[PDB]
Curated annotation (Swiss-Prot), chain A:
Function: Non-selective calcium permeant cation channel involved in detection of noxious chemical and thermal stimuli. Seems to mediate proton influx and may be involved in intracellular acidosis in nociceptive neurons. Involved in mediation of inflammatory pain and hyperalgesia. Sensitized by a phosphatidylinositol second messenger system activated by receptor tyrosine kinases, which involves PKC isozymes and PCL. Activation by vanilloids, like capsaicin, and temperatures higher than 42 degrees Celsius.
Tissue: Predominantly expressed in trigeminal and dorsal root sensory ganglia. Expressed also in hippocampus, cortex, cerebellum, olfactory bulb, mesencephalon and hindbrain. High expression in the cell bodies and dendrites of neurons in the hippocampus and in the cortex. In the brain detected also in astrocytes and pericytes (at protein level). Isoform 1 and isoform 3 are expressed in brain and peripheral blood mononuclear cells.
Binding annotation for resiniferatoxin: 379-380, 418, 425
Sites of Phosphothreonine modification: 238, 550
Protein modification: Phosphorylation by PKA reverses capsaicin-induced dephosphorylation at multiple sites, probably including Ser-4 as a major phosphorylation site. Phosphorylation by CAMKII seems to regulate binding to vanilloids. Phosphorylated and modulated by PRKCE, PRKCM and probably PRKCZ. Dephosphorylation by calcineurin seems to lead to receptor desensitization and phosphorylation by CAMKII recovers activity.
Listed result of changing residue 482 to Q: Slight modification of pore attributes
Gene giving rise to this polypeptide: Trpv1
Organism annotation: Rattus norvegicus
Membrane side Extracellular: residue ranges: 322-339, 400-403, 496-503
Residues of the full protein shown: 113 to 752 of 838
Regulation: Channel activity is activated via the interaction with PIRT and phosphatidylinositol 4,5-bisphosphate (PIP2). Both PIRT and PIP2 are required to activate channel activity. The channel is sensitized by ATP binding. Repeated stimulation with capsaicin gives rise to progressively smaller responses, due to desensitization. This desensitization is triggered by the influx of calcium ions and is inhibited by elevated ATP levels. Ca(2+) and CALM displace ATP from its binding site and trigger a conformation change that leads to a closed, desensitized channel.
The protein's name: Transient receptor potential cation channel subfamily V member 1
Length: 598, 289
């Protein structure tokens, strides 16, 4: 009976198996007998697997027995052996004929564990170097290293897929990455594993850069290997050293400009769901690269753009200033030179407006941002787009015989000038100040203004339900104002004599002053102090990221003027390679010094 | 053993050790008996006693208790349901944490009279954190938002009826045939009904909770304020059928407190609840000094 043998194997006794074997020959889930045996195995107490294998051999078609349920769909006995750190059973299964099995079930894709869908990926992802060595070098059937799973994740893909940014996890993930990469080199010196890409097309380096795994990225970018056979695996090199001085190179294989999305363009354009996209510009080559680009070929472009915006704002201001006032829009052009100048200024203004409108639309299309985090990812794109909207609405209402266009233009102009702060990112000690303004406007004023409006409305309704109006203080707008003024140090504790009782009125105003002016407002000062003292450092990081985005956008914009004139680094030969005795890369040089090493 | 702990590391250490040893010994000597169920004159189980007295260490121990011995695996309160790689899925007992015979652990932690040293860290134990978050996620967030919306509507109609109070003569006022006057009187009746609701809620809270007189502004700052708003509303009612125009001096107060009390509902949101807590603490200490 099937249940009798199941009970026996769970009992770890072979007596029933021995009794039934002669009769065996004489004659939902789908779990295999050997599968249950290894599952119900303690201290190697399960030996009936060998008996079952020998019985089957005495009778290929069984060494590939796999689960069927959607939860464990495809789960294989080799995977079960590996999960338990089984070497003897794994080797026995491999020799007997039981390495490219695909465990495409849900559990391997809710609560679950992802390692890839191959035995090699499982063995690597579980910190088992010896087992992966044997699996990839098993003589009966060698486990392939280039096998590709459903979503495309190979073993290196998976190793990136598993990190968590911790010290020990990053430690052994990097260790196994290095070992498996050297092993793939020696077994297949012709192949280059890293180039492989998943369904999304992201290289493991690009994947570790997008997902947020800084440790793996720092590793991959700072990678050098000395072995004579496989020195081509390096991305870093040392070009000389004299005393305590050194001069190293870096690879920049496709960091600068890559096939689809390089590392830098993916770090900068991360949608802020990533944990740390701000520390991820701390790696040495990226810091040096951004500083170099800023120094050489984009500081002048940024200052030119800033000067052009300043001039645009000056003419917009000085044309809006002299707007015609008599009659209705439009206005008939006078023969005077000044009127010509004014209309030229207006046309310049509207041209800038449409430019900014199209830039905003294009940014939206390319970037495809969310709706909940749109005021955290990009605070300034929204504001430039809004200024453009106001300018265009004013245009719409200036050819529509209406004088409300000014109410638009004013707004626009204000935003215009206030937006000059956008350009204070090219300077550190001002960019950090603008970042702090950003953060406070987003958090502190929102909280404080909700609470303050609750208090103000409560007490102003309480004070208009008292007045009787028997000027026109019997208003909720005018009471809302006269009580707002208290906050700006202009509150007149007696602004009206229309009230039944004086004690109630004055107790009401005193409670309001004590609760908002003395308590709340000084509390806001205190909370601003604490928030400043916290974000002192995150502001620097966000400024760095802002400037990085500025550099990337500028280089993308003027690819027409100089698409390849400004390439980072120099095309150098670091060394030879066994493949073709050629190793020429666009490498980047940095010096260094040290005294302890000597 | 619960009666002796002091929340220190070593005292908690050996108190837990001896608790475990004596419990296993009682199991082996008397496998039929269950010691924990026993209760003192007050009727509090040792777990409930360690939860009420403030002994967080002993509570964390008792709630996170598992035993592997074949004979006495029934002593566990925690279990492991599977593990595949680096992953695990554990269970917890909740014997009578949720709803217990007289006073469960949770109802006794929450309702501690603040004489207890640390009733705020005592919700840091894993099962209680997870339980509170789960309940909030599933079946009470909607109820809280519904109550908050109802209070907002009550406050809006109270405000907009108090706003248009009749001004000529003395109270009461003869209902005009105008539709607006009908609307106004309906609003007033709604207001007073809410007022009596809040008054009875305050009285019931006092009776059940039996708080002190020196620490009444530390234990519950908002029950007092809701009760006071109800008192002002009821006094205004008393002076609106007593031919007197001082009722307004009451109502105004009431309304103010009303709107200011909306902050009570900012506890369902973390970054606003913390702000309201800070307002509470400053009003209690700094403004007084
Ligand atoms: C393209 C240029 C447009 C920019 C300015 C156009 C202003 C014309 C209005 C005008 O002449 O109105 C007249 C008064 O105008 C004046 O007399 C004032 C001129 C001083 C403005 C100089 C500051 C510019 C910074 C450098 C009266 O109408
Ligand atoms: C002068 C009239 C408008 C120019 C203002 C302007 O674009 O500001 C500058 C012209 O900088 C340029 O390089 C564009 C020049 C092309 C305009 C030619 C059309 C004239 C007819 C734009 O400066 P910017 O800071 O690159 O724009 C940032 C706008 N976002 C991305 C923040 C939305
Ligand atoms: C139950 C409902 C009671 C709540 C409102 C009762 C107001 C009646 C007073 C009245 O009509 O007086 C008349 C003026 O009243 C008006 O013309 C003002 C009406 C605007 C109020 C809308 C805001 C409500 C939010 C949504 C004059 O008496
Ligand atoms: C609308 C008129 C009054 C309702 C306002 C009110 O109770 O606020 C809401 C009606 O929430 C309810 O679920 C009660 C509904 C019953 C009322 C029916 C009587 C109508 C005749 C009460 O909301 P809450 O926040 O539960 O009250 C907290 C009050 N304490 C505990 C802080 C004192
Ligand atoms: C006009 C061109 C401005 C040249 C920028 C030099 C620079 O970037 O300075 C860094 C920060 O300084 C600043 O406060 C920048 C302020 C510049 C004036 C802004 C006013 C704009 C009005 C037009 C630190 O420099 P560092 O620490 O020495 O490295
Ligand atoms: C109306 C329903 C409001 C939905 C609440 C969502 C939530 O609870 O948000 C947490 C805190 O957010 C907030 O500032 C809450 C503010 C909500 C608006 C209050 C205005 C009331 C006027 C009526 C943190 O969330 P998290 O960190 O992502 O976890
Ligand atoms: C970089 C510069 C840094 C600091 C310089 C600040 C001094 C700016 C003074 C602008 C002069 C001014 O207000 O002109 C008035 C306003 O003119 C404008 O609208 C120019 C606006 C440009 C502002 C940028 C500086 C003249 O109008 P009126 O005669 O009052 O009628
Ligand atoms: C959630 C909403 C968050 C923010 C919205 C704030 C805007 C509220 C404006 C209320 C309109 C108002 O004042 O109406 C006036 C007052 O009406 C009221 O009393 C309604 C009170 C409800 C306030 C809740 C918001 C109309 O009276 P009048 O014509 O001045 O005499
Ligand atoms: C443009 O980029 C930035 C801009 C700012 C300053 N601008 C603001 O804070 C927005 C204020 C808008 C107020 C306009 C009100 C009108 C309706 C009268 C700080 C950091 C930046 O990165
Ligand atoms: C209702 O619960 C809360 C309420 C508040 C704010 N409310 C207060 O501070 C009380 C102020 C009362 C002032 C009234 C004065 C009248 C006499 C004119 C903070 C935290 C909470 O938990």
């Amino acid at each position: 009976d099937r249940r009798s043998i199941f009970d026996a194997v769970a009992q770890s006794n072979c007596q029933e198996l021995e009794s039934l074997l002669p009769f065996l020959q004489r004659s939902e889930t789908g779990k295999t007998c050997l599968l249950k045996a290894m599952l119900n195995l303690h201290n190697g107490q399960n030996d009936t697997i060998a008996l079952l294998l020998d019985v089957a051999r005495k009778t290929k078609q069984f060494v590939n027995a796999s689960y069927t349920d959607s939860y464990y769909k495809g789960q294989t006995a080799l995977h079960i052996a590996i999960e338990r750190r089984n070497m003897t059973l794994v080797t026995l299964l491999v020799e007997n004929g039981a390495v490219q099995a695909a465990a495409n079930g849900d559990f391997f894709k809710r609560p679950g564990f992802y390692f890839g869908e191959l035995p090699l990926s499982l063995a690597a992802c579980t910190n088992q170097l010896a087992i992966v060595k044997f699996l990839l070098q098993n003589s009966w059937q060698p486990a392939d290293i280039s096998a590709r799973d459903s979503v495309g994740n190979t073993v290196l893909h998976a190793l990136v897929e598993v990190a968590d940014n911790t010290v020990d996890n990053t430690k052994f993930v990097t260790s196994m990455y290095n070992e498996i990469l050297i092993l793939g080199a020696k077994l297949h010196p012709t192949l280059k594993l890293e180039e492989i890409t998943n369904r999304k097309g992201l290289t493991p380096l690009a994947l570790a850069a997008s997902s947020g795994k800084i440790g793996v990225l720092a590793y991959i970018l700072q990678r050098e290997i000395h072995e004579p056979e496989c020195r081509h695996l390096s991305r870093k090199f040392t070009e000389w050293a004299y005393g305590p001085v050194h001069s190293s190179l870096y690879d920049l294989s496709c960091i600068d400009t890559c096939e689809k999305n390089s590392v830098l363009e993916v770090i900068a354009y991360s949608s802020s769901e990533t944990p740390n996209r701000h520390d991820m510009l701390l790696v040495e080559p990226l810091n040096r690269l951004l500083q170099d680009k800023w120094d050489r070929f984009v500081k002048r472009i940024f200052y030119f753009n800033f000067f052009v915006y300043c001039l645009y704002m000056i003419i917009f201001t000085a044309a809006a200033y002299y707007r015609p006032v008599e009659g209705l829009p439009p206005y008939k052009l006078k023969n005077t030179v000044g009127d010509y100048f004014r209309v030229t200024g207006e046309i310049l203004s509207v041209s800038g407006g449409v430019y900014f409108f199209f830039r905003g639309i294009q940014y939206f299309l390319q970037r495809r941002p969310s709706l909940k985090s749109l005021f955290v990812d990009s605070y300034s794109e929204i504001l430039f787009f809004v200024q453009s909207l106001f300018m265009l609405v004013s245009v719409v209402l200036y050819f529509s015989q209406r004088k409300e266009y000014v109410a638009s233009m004013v707004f626009s102009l204000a935003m215009g000038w206030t937006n000059m702060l956008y350009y204070t990112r090219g300077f550190q000690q001002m960019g950090i100040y603008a970042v702090m303004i950003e953060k406070m406007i987003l958090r502190d004023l929102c909280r404080f203004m909700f609470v303050y409006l609750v208090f103000l409305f409560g007490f102003s309704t309480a004070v208009v339900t008292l007045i009787e109006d028997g000027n026109s203080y019997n208003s909720l707008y005018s009471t809302c104002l006269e009580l707002f003024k208290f906050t700006i140090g202009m509150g007149d504790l007696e602004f009206t004599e229309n009230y039944d009782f004086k004690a109630v009125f004055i107790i009401l105003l005193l409670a309001y002053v004590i609760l908002t002016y003395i308590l709340l407002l000084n509390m806001l000062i205190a909370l601003m102090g604490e928030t400043v003292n916290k974000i002192a450092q995150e502001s620097k990081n966000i400024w760095k990221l802002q400037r990085a985005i500025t550099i990337l956008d500028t280089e993308k914009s003027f690819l027409k003027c100089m698409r390849k004139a400004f390439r980072s680094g120099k095309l150098l030969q670091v060394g030879f390679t066994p493949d073709g005795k050629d190793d020429y890369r666009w490498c980047f040089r940095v010096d260094e010094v040290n005294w302890t090493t000597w």
